[PDB]
Structure formats: C-alpha cells, structure tokens
Design an enzyme around this catalytic site. Structure first.
Site, PDB file in Angstrom:
ATOM      1  N   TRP A   1       0.832  -1.204   0.000  1.00  0.00           N
ATOM      2  CA  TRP A   1       0.000   0.000   0.000  1.00  0.00           C
ATOM      3  C   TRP A   1       0.868   1.256   0.000  1.00  0.00           C
ATOM      4  O   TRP A   1       1.578   1.524   0.973  1.00  0.00           O
ATOM      5  CB  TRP A   1      -0.900   0.019   1.245  1.00  0.00           C
ATOM      6  CG  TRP A   1      -2.100  -0.864   1.149  1.00  0.00           C
ATOM      7  CD1 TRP A   1      -3.295  -0.561   0.562  1.00  0.00           C
ATOM      8  CD2 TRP A   1      -2.209  -2.212   1.615  1.00  0.00           C
ATOM      9  NE1 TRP A   1      -4.146  -1.638   0.629  1.00  0.00           N
ATOM     10  CE2 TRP A   1      -3.507  -2.670   1.267  1.00  0.00           C
ATOM     11  CE3 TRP A   1      -1.341  -3.087   2.289  1.00  0.00           C
ATOM     12  CZ2 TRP A   1      -3.957  -3.961   1.570  1.00  0.00           C
ATOM     13  CZ3 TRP A   1      -1.787  -4.375   2.592  1.00  0.00           C
ATOM     14  CH2 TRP A   1      -3.087  -4.799   2.229  1.00  0.00           C
TER      15      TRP A   1
ATOM     16  N   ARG B   1      -4.222   6.348  -2.316  1.00  0.00           N
ATOM     17  CA  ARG B   1      -2.997   5.605  -2.583  1.00  0.00           C
ATOM     18  C   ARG B   1      -2.050   6.467  -3.426  1.00  0.00           C
ATOM     19  O   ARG B   1      -2.472   7.100  -4.394  1.00  0.00           O
ATOM     20  CB  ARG B   1      -3.330   4.316  -3.335  1.00  0.00           C
ATOM     21  CG  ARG B   1      -2.951   3.060  -2.596  1.00  0.00           C
ATOM     22  CD  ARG B   1      -3.749   1.885  -3.097  1.00  0.00           C
ATOM     23  NE  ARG B   1      -4.607   1.310  -2.061  1.00  0.00           N
ATOM     24  CZ  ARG B   1      -5.206   0.122  -2.161  1.00  0.00           C
ATOM     25  NH1 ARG B   1      -5.036  -0.616  -3.250  1.00  0.00           N
ATOM     26  NH2 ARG B   1      -5.988  -0.330  -1.184  1.00  0.00           N
TER      27      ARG B   1
ATOM     28  N   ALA C   1     -14.726 -11.009   5.864  1.00  0.00           N
ATOM     29  CA  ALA C   1     -14.782  -9.639   5.431  1.00  0.00           C
ATOM     30  C   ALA C   1     -14.347  -9.662   3.991  1.00  0.00           C
ATOM     31  O   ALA C   1     -13.694 -10.616   3.566  1.00  0.00           O
ATOM     32  CB  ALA C   1     -13.833  -8.798   6.254  1.00  0.00           C
TER      33      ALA C   1
ATOM     34  N   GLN D   1     -13.883   2.375  -2.229  1.00  0.00           N
ATOM     35  CA  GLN D   1     -13.946   0.943  -2.001  1.00  0.00           C
ATOM     36  C   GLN D   1     -15.204   0.713  -1.170  1.00  0.00           C
ATOM     37  O   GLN D   1     -15.803   1.664  -0.639  1.00  0.00           O
ATOM     38  CB  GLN D   1     -12.751   0.491  -1.172  1.00  0.00           C
ATOM     39  CG  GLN D   1     -11.506   0.065  -1.868  1.00  0.00           C
ATOM     40  CD  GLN D   1     -10.441  -0.527  -0.958  1.00  0.00           C
ATOM     41  OE1 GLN D   1     -10.572  -0.375   0.287  1.00  0.00           O
ATOM     42  NE2 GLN D   1      -9.438  -1.180  -1.493  1.00  0.00           N
TER      43      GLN D   1
ATOM     44  N   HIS E   1      -7.255   2.034   2.572  1.00  0.00           N
ATOM     45  CA  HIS E   1      -8.335   1.135   2.192  1.00  0.00           C
ATOM     46  C   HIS E   1      -9.357   1.334   3.290  1.00  0.00           C
ATOM     47  O   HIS E   1      -9.073   2.034   4.261  1.00  0.00           O
ATOM     48  CB  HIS E   1      -7.871  -0.320   2.154  1.00  0.00           C
ATOM     49  CG  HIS E   1      -7.125  -0.743   3.376  1.00  0.00           C
ATOM     50  ND1 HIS E   1      -6.540  -1.984   3.497  1.00  0.00           N
ATOM     51  CD2 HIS E   1      -6.840  -0.075   4.522  1.00  0.00           C
ATOM     52  CE1 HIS E   1      -5.923  -2.063   4.665  1.00  0.00           C
ATOM     53  NE2 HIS E   1      -6.089  -0.920   5.306  1.00  0.00           N
TER      54      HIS E   1
ATOM     55  N   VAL F   1      -6.500 -11.747   6.917  1.00  0.00           N
ATOM     56  CA  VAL F   1      -7.410 -12.878   6.685  1.00  0.00           C
ATOM     57  C   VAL F   1      -6.697 -14.151   6.246  1.00  0.00           C
ATOM     58  O   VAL F   1      -5.802 -14.141   5.382  1.00  0.00           O
ATOM     59  CB  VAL F   1      -8.533 -12.598   5.619  1.00  0.00           C
ATOM     60  CG1 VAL F   1      -9.513 -11.557   6.130  1.00  0.00           C
ATOM     61  CG2 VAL F   1      -7.921 -12.193   4.299  1.00  0.00           C
TER      62      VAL F   1
HETATM   63  N1  LIG Z   1      -9.665  -3.406   1.276  1.00  0.00           N
HETATM   64  C1  LIG Z   1      -8.758  -4.557   0.926  1.00  0.00           C
HETATM   65  C2  LIG Z   1      -9.636  -5.671   0.241  1.00  0.00           C
HETATM   66  C3  LIG Z   1      -9.979  -6.800   1.200  1.00  0.00           C
HETATM   67  C4  LIG Z   1     -10.891  -6.620   2.241  1.00  0.00           C
HETATM   68  C5  LIG Z   1     -11.148  -7.649   3.155  1.00  0.00           C
HETATM   69  C6  LIG Z   1     -10.502  -8.875   3.049  1.00  0.00           C
HETATM   70  C7  LIG Z   1      -9.578  -9.073   2.022  1.00  0.00           C
HETATM   71  C8  LIG Z   1      -9.329  -8.026   1.105  1.00  0.00           C
HETATM   72  C9  LIG Z   1      -7.625  -4.156   0.023  1.00  0.00           C
HETATM   73  O1  LIG Z   1      -7.111  -3.077   0.218  1.00  0.00           O
HETATM   74  O2  LIG Z   1      -7.236  -4.764  -0.822  1.00  0.00           O
END
Ligand SMILES: N[C@@H](Cc1ccccc1)C(=O)O
Ligand SMILES: N[C@@H](Cc1ccccc1)C(=O)O
Ligand SMILES: [Mg+2]
Ligand SMILES: [Mg+2]
EC number: 6.1.1.20
Lengths: 346, 265, 214, 265
Positions: D64, D119, D229, D133, D93, D176
């Site tokens: 990021w 970003r 999520a 997003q 994000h 995750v």
């Molecule tokens: N917001 C995340 C996307 C994501 C959300 C939740 C679980 C996995 C991926 C990203 O920046 O990529």
C-alpha cells in the site's frame, strides 16, 4: 503431502511444518492449506441467519440521513459533483482563508500538498475549467465532502451562476443571490427545518452580499456572493455560494391538529430605517403578534417617495386562528395593537 | 443588500404519511430479504374469496363487507395476463395477491404486498372504508411458525425497542392454520398494540394455486413446501407512529395536514 | 384430553375427533391444537435462510420505479395527495368526460357510486375545498392512483394554481401554464426521458391552452 | 397559445455515478441484512496497518503506497470519541473501519463500509490515487467461508445473472486466513471480472480488537466468534456497469459527463 509432521491421535493434532514454510504459524494458516489443496470451489454455498446483537440496531441512521439529503438536492435541481480532497497551499491566499492544518509529506504535486479545509474553493475552481471547456450559460450544483481543520468534518456546499431561471425567449430572468436563497429555503422546507440568514463579514465573501447561515436556530456555514476581488483574480464573472457543516440537526415532528374555524385576516405595513435588517423586523412583529398568529408573510416593500428618505415600507399579510373556537374581533384589533405598540415603541 | 430578506418563492413538496409509513415498513422487510410487489384494487370474487379458503354461504365470507361491482367491457387480468372470470368487487384485503404471486412464481421466496383495500363500513374517527394493508408471504420447504414469530419480532425491534416485544394469540382465518393475531409492545406509550393477523398458509390455498396453475398449463410447485403469511393495518400504525388522531384525516386532502409531514425524512 | 381417539403405533397416527368439533378436519387443524394448548409463546424464535428461486429475481423493479418517481416529485416541489377511488357519476358531466365503466352495486353514497376514470377531477375538487377551509395563495401538487376504464390503470396527475413563484415582496411573478411545463420538463430532465407537448383538443381542457403529452 | 414552446428554465439536478453505484451496491447488501456505516478518511497508522496484521518493516506494509501527513492541533477521534495516537496518514483502504466498528460493538452483525480511499500512484486511464472501495464484514459464532461464498454469489446474481457466477481463488492478505480474490461472471460482455478480495478474519485482528477494548475498559467480545470480510473497488464496477471508459473521468468535474447520468434512476 505438504511435508508436515503430524503426531497425535485426534481430535486435536500436533503438526510441525517444514522449515521452508514461514507462512505456517497458526492453526488457521493450516486450514487455508487444506482449503486450497481441496480447492476453494469445493466449498459449498450458504447464508447465515441470526438476530444481531442489540447495540448494532440504529447504526445506519447517519449514513441514511446523509443520503436522503443527497437525494433531495438532486431532486431539487442540483448537479452533484466530486472533488479531490487535496488543496493547493497557495489558494489559502488566492481565496481569503486560513492555512491548511494538515500537509502531505509526499504530496502528489505542490498544488495538492495540503488537505482541503473548505469545499467551495474546489467548486468555484471547477466552475472555471467548465467554462473553458464548454460554455454553460448557468450552473447550479453541490458537493458533499470531508474537509480537514482541527477535526475531520463532513461539509456541504453549493454554487450558483448564470443568467438564472425564467423564460428562455422572454426577456427577464430571475437569478442572483435571492435565487440561491430561494432554493435554500425550499430545501429546508422539505427537510422540515427552520432556516434563516443574518449578515456576516466573511473574508472570502463580497460584503453587503455576505451572511452567516442559521439552520433551525443554529449557526452553521454561510451563504453569499463570491467576493469580486477573487471573482476577477480568476477569469470569472459573478458567482453565488454557501457551505455548511453536517449532520444537519433535526426537529422531531410534533403533529398538531389544525382548527376548522376560519382565520382572522389582516393588511399591515411597517416603516423603518433603510439600514435595519428584515430579520429583526419580522422578529419583533412576530414575537408580539400573540399566541394566535397563524401566518406572517411579506407581499411587498419599496424605499418610497411618500415617506422619510431614510426609511422603508413593508407589506405584511396576517392570519390568525383559534383551535377550539372562532376568534372574536375583540381579541384581533386588540392584539394587533399589542404589536404596533412595542412595534416602533422600540 | 438586505440578506435577511425572503428569497424566490419556490415550491417545497412533501409526501403523504401513508407513503412514508408504507416506505418505512417496506425498508424494514427489505432488510430481511422481502421483495415488494402490488396487486389490482379491482379483483375477482375468485382470488378474493374462493382461492383463499373462503366459502360462499358460510360465516367466513361474512367477515368482510364487500363492495360489489358492475359494468361491461372491463378486462380483468389474471396472474399471467390471461382474462379471468368471477363476480367483480373491490379487494377486501391484500391476500388475493398471495395467490396471484404463487400461481406466477416458484418457491422459495419472501414477498410483501402494500396496497389500498376497500370495506363497506361507516367512516368514523378510527374506521374507514378505504384504507391500506401490508401483506407478507414467505414460502419454502422447511418454513415453520418460529420463522413467522422471528419475522414479526424483528419488525417490532425495527419499530420500537430493543425494549419492545411481541404477542401471539391464536385466532381464526380461513386461509391459515394455525391462525393467530399479534400485538406489539410499545415501550414509550406503554401499551399493547394489536397489529395484524398471520399464520401458516392453509393447505387448501396451496391446493387452489397448483390447480389453477395446471389449468394454465404450468407444473405444480407448492406440493411439499410450507409457508406463513401475515397482514397488518397501515393507517393504525401510521397514526400511532406519526401521532395522528383522526383516521379520516388521511383521505381528507387538507394541506395544513399533509405539509405537517414534509420533512419526515 | 380434547376428546380425540388416537389409534396407531406411530409415527403417523389415526385420530378421530369428537363430533362437537367441526373445525377439525385436516392434520394441520390438529397441529394448531397442540400449539394453542402448549401455548403460542412456547414456540421459539427463528429466521429462515435460502437462495430464492430464480424467477423471483427482478420482481421489485416496478414498485421501486414508481417510488423513485414518487420521491423525485416531492423533491421537485410537489405536495403528494391521497384521493378516494370513488367517483360521483354526476361529475362525468360536470367535467366533460365519458361515463364510468364500473359502478357499485352497494355504493357508499350516490356521489361515490362509480369508479374514478380520471384522477384530476378529484384533485381539482380538493383544490376547491382547500380554498374554502384555508386560503392558500398558490398550490402545486400531485397524486398517483389507480383509475378504472377498460382495464385498471396506474395514473399520475398534477395540479398548479396561484400567483406563481418569484419575489414575494417584488411585484412580478412567473406562473401559469408555462410554469407547469417548466417543472414538467425538469422532471423528465431528471428521469432522463425526452418529453415534449403538442396542441390537442380536450373536452375538459380550455382549447388553445390544451395539449397532449409526449 | 403556442404550447410547444419551452417552459420556465428550471434546474434539473443529478447525482454522481459513484453515488449511484455506491447506492446500488448498498441497496444490494441491505437486502441481505448488511448495515452501512462510514469511517474517517484521515486515520492513524495504528488502525490502518497495525490493528490489521500489517507489519512495519516487512513486505506487507509495502503493498500500500501511503500518503503520510503532518500538522498540529488536529484531533483524531477513536471508536469511542477518545483521542488516539500514531503517525497520521490517509486511509489506504476501508479495512480500518473493520476495527473501529468491532471495538465499538458486539457480535453478531453484518456491516458494509463505503468510503473514499487514497494511494500514492500515478493517475492514468485505469488507475487513480483517489478512489472508493466498499468493505464488508460479518462477525458471529458459526460464520464460515461458505457464507462468504454465498454472500458474494448473491451479489453476482444481484448485478448480472441469474446467468452469472463467481470465482474464488486463494490470495494473500495479512488480515485474513484463508485469504482469497474473487471474480465475477459477466454474461453480457462475456468475461471474468476480478472484483475484490475477501477471507476469514485473521485471529490477530480479533486479538487486537479485544486488547484495545480492554485498554478502554470494555470486556472482550470476539473470543470464540468467527467472521469474514471483503472489499471491492467501486470505480471499476461503476465503469463496467454504466459503461465509462476513463477512471479519471470521475474526479474530472466536467458537466457534460456528470449529466449523462441524470436519470440513471
Ligand atoms: N480493502 C482490501 C480488500 C480486502 C478486504 C477484506 C478482506 C480481504 C481483502 C484491500 O485493500 O485490498
Ligand atoms: N389481510 C388479512 C390479515 C391476515 C393476513 C395473512 C394471514 C392472516 C391474516 C385480513 O384481512 O385480515
Ligand atoms: Mg497460508
Ligand atoms: Mg383449529
């Protein structure tokens, strides 16, 4: 098969991963493995069902509130617009306003090195570039965005410009500041909120055409004609603005039975100094009208040859009513004086 | 310039309280996956009574004071655009839609049906001949009463609460067995509000549906599926909610009244 | 305990109800019984979860469409109104229009013995009674309702009246027909639909100031 | 009078495509019981990185490109109105919201979080530095991946289909495990669209939450609960949906463009 050692008899096992595997530390990491090897497609489809913890109940309100508003506007006649949250530190000057409290350490460009403290600057700026690309005769729009001062804040601003509305072919138009206000008032009429404006000195707003905004009894944002000095510092003609802070407060409705007994009608005018603001006038007249004043409108006014050089006339239409019974004239021409008395007794 | 002056007299619109209430109720059920669909105000005695286990000469038909119609060249459309027959009348409740929808679709599903209904009655401060109801139907294999119970319970919470609760008492309806009437707990005003009726869709209703479907060429879809349906009076709730005192007020096109709900949202 | 005879070993039983019980015919009737006797409150709370049959997918569209519209109007400046679906057969005359195709057999009153074929009559009528109760200078509203001709139909009508808009104090106003059109056009501008008007002779509309809508 | 003449030039408003798309997506998840809530555009390195298993000096933080901020007297509010610390930046994000919400609430629940993110990147026809997003989070005992799968599947159907379908491939995310990227089947244009990432909430994230909660005096609520999520790029979808060709177009306040979506609904 992935090179793990598995000891134990079950139901919980002792699994030691191969050293080349660094991503394998938790039990979950281990699950992701069976999954990818079995195949994510082999996982069935399902939907969960549950009664959500109570503290999650109201949650949507704020968001929802913001959107209803967003929608009303578009329905009222405003084009929505999306502007970068960045700001050119230089414009803190160009537009008479304080400097940005937040700056970037890795700006995209020196002209987007700060964080917008105000929304309107961006709007106006958009106006310009639109004129240069396509030449729109008039324009009315808004934008809702986050501005950054001491705290992050949700702001709402709108800009008007152009000839105004009226008959295209026919000569006249009706525009300018009182047009923007016209709309503003209707909006609150639609939101069920009491709004009014009071002259206020604003560094970026042409004075005389400057004014703070009072939503339902509160001070939030401003409204006015863009200070000409800036109007010109930019290849731009006259523009009209307003920028508020959200969320708008809200008055929970208290329903109220309207009476059937006909109202008491009245013709009335007030003569007061040319400087005095409509406000105080309506204010007083209103505060003295009595508890039975149904309506209070203004149908006319002019400076006027037939009266004091430094005073003006005021066409005020009046209505009265009593819930339970009809209003006895005894109380009408009576309460009428209750006003006239303290009217210019002041 | 005097800025405190009034601007250009622009028209500020508003919405009818029923519409608001309707909307609110709909948004609620929508969050539970219910989809909104409407039916016709002019129905056939078949969809209004016969389809739902309502007899001609028995005590049941006698619970709804119906408006009978007459006139020719009027074309009534069935669930599939076909022309249907039967003495014409004014939908006495929104339940007929239950049928039209089932004939036209396949389970499992969740629907909700707002709509203006008509009953021959003398109009007073709490009784109208013209009013609105909101029907709800959820059919699918496995559906049980606990689902209905939760359904209604969620609705309560959504309206008042989480300090509110629901009351379910047995009651009789020709198109549901078990049948029940349900009340809701209003924490604020402190009383029980009888909201509407509900129950497990009656077998003869499902039977009816399939029968008409086949008569229309379609294969049976409601054998081996369960379902519950409910219906509630909207005006009542709207009155309690927005604090209105006279039900007649709604069809009384007075502005001073209507405007009172301008900013309700 | 309810006086039924129960034969059989299970899992499905032979239950014969007492003759005084006429409401007991089906198995379901029998279930409603255990329920009420056990108590409706003893039934737990739950929520169903399932992927809905495909033919139920789009369903909400129509309703939704109607509502967005309903909403835009109010946001544009129209007060919504609710009118009875009834009609006084007499007005078929009063207002130059054909007669109602549907009549009641048990009307509430001879003045609501037919079914509105048009919406506007009711609107106008409302206008009147409002003037008599409270005296509104101007008025702009609409109403969406079902009218009945050869087929049931969803209609939308709007009425304007009054001085018009402009400066309250300042002399002029801008109103009349071209005002209503002004709004109409903006509405379609908002719906993304092309609308225009062409003069048309209408029995109930002043000619010269009459026109069909496209 | 000439009726074909133009009426009073009245202003016809419109809405921004992102708003429309956002709206559409929201209405979709709302039907599955998800509730919409927003977070702050200016966040703390703690909520943006640390809370979610994102390390300082390791390869993850390096996915990021963040905008770092500076300035004094700026007050950043934590989930409970408290003041929090950490290097300031622009949310990279919407995931941070995941945390703020959990710290502030109790499972089970379903939320969805729209929001503008930033970003550090060079702006081209398909890449922006400023975009939006939509994050989604559903926590509760029993939650599994099949739920996520169904979730996304319903979303697909809602957008295209029922002749459309979903693709789930394993991918890596610090917050995750299992992690995955998902694509959607577009029957019309005939291609696979990579939509966003999702997965089962990481244990260290839950850990973080509870830890901060206790530091705030609250009792732990995320021990023994599961959750998934997901998050997807809005502009991409909006472009595919409303048929736009240049992503730069959105932040380019040109009217001729904006008006094109006047009646989108
Ligand atoms: N917001 C995340 C996307 C994501 C959300 C939740 C679980 C996995 C991926 C990203 O920046 O990529
Ligand atoms: N509409 C029904 C209410 C109801 C609906 C469904 C089941 C039971 C009752 C009525 O007229 O009373
Ligand atoms: Mg792994
Ligand atoms: Mg029984």
């Amino acid at each position: 098969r992935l090179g793990c050692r598995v000891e134990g008899e079950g139901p919980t096992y002792r699994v030691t991963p191969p050293s080349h595997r660094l991503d394998l530390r938790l039990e979950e990491d281990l699950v992701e493995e069976v999954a990818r090897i079995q195949g994510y497609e082999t996982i069935p489809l399902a939907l969960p069902a549950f009664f959500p913890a109570p503290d999650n109940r109201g949650v949507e309100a704020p968001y929802r509130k913001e959107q209803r508003l967003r929608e009303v506007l578009s329905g009222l006649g405003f084009q929505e617009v999306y502007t970068y949250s960045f700001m050119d530190p230089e414009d803190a000057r160009r537009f008479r306003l304080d400097p940005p409290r937040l700056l970037l350490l890795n700006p995209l460009a020196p002209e987007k090195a700060a964080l917008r403290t105000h929304l309107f600057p961006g709007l106006v700026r958009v106006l310009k570039e639109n004129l240069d690309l396509d030449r729109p005769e008039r324009a009315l729009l808004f934008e809702v965005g986050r501005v950054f001062r001491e705290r992050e804040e949700t702001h709402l601003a709108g800009l008007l410009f152009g000839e105004g509305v009226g008959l295209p072919w026919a000569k006249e138009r009706l525009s300018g500041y009182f047009l923007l206000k016209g709309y503003l008032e209707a909006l609150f009429a639609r939101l069920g909120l009491a709004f009014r404006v009071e002259a206020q000195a604003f560094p970026f707003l042409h004075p005389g055409v400057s004014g703070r905004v009072l939503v339902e009894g509160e001070e939030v944002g401003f409204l006015g004609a863009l200070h000409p000095e800036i109007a010109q510092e930019l290849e731009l003609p006259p523009v009209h603005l307003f920028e508020l802070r959200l969320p708008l407060p809200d008055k929970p409705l208290a329903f109220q039975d309207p009476s059937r007994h006909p109202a008491a009608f009245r013709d009335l005018a007030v003569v007061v100094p040319a400087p005095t603001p409509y406000g105080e006038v309506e204010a007083l007249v209103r505060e003295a009208a009595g508890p039975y004043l149904e309506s209070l409108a203004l149908f006319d006014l002019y400076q006027g040859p037939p009266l004091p050089e430094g005073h003006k006339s005021l066409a005020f239409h009046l209505r009265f009513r009593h819930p339970k019974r009809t209003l006895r004239d005894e109380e009408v021409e009576e309460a009428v004086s209750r006003v006239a008395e303290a009217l210019r007794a002041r | 310039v005097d800025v405190s002056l009034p601007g250009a007299s622009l028209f500020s619109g508003g919405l009818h309280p029923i519409t608001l209430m309707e909307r609110e109720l709909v948004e609620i059920f929508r969050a539970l996956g219910y989809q909104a669909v409407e039916g016709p105000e002019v129905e056939s005695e078949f969809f209004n009574f016969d389809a739902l286990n309502i007899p001609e000469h028995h005590p049941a038909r006698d619970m709804w004071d119906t408006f009978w119609l007459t006139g020719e060249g009027f074309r009534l459309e069935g669930p599939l655009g076909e022309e249907v027959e039967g003495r014409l009348l004014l939908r006495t409740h929104t339940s007929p839609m239950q049928v039209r929808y089932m004939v036209a679709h396949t389970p499992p599903f969740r629907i909700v049906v707002p709509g203006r209904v008509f009953r021959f009655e003398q109009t007073d401060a709490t009784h109208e001949a013209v009013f609105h109801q909101l029907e709800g139907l959820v059919v699918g294999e496995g559906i049980a009463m606990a689902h209905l119970k939760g359904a209604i319970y969620e609705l309560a919470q959504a309206l008042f609460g989480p300090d509110s609760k629901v009351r379910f008492q047995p009651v009789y309806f020709p198109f549901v067995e078990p049948g029940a009437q349900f009340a809701v707990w209003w924490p604020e005003g402190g009383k029980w509000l009888e909201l509407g009726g509900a129950g497990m869709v009656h077998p003869k209703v499902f039977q009816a549906v399939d029968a008409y479907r086949e008569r229309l060429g379609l294969p049976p879809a409601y054998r081996g599926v369960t379902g519950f349906a409910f219906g509630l009076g909207v005006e009542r709730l709207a009155m309690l909610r927005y604090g209105i005192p006279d039900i007649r007020y709604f069809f009384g096109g007075r502005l001073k009244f209507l405007e009172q709900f301008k900013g309700v949202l």
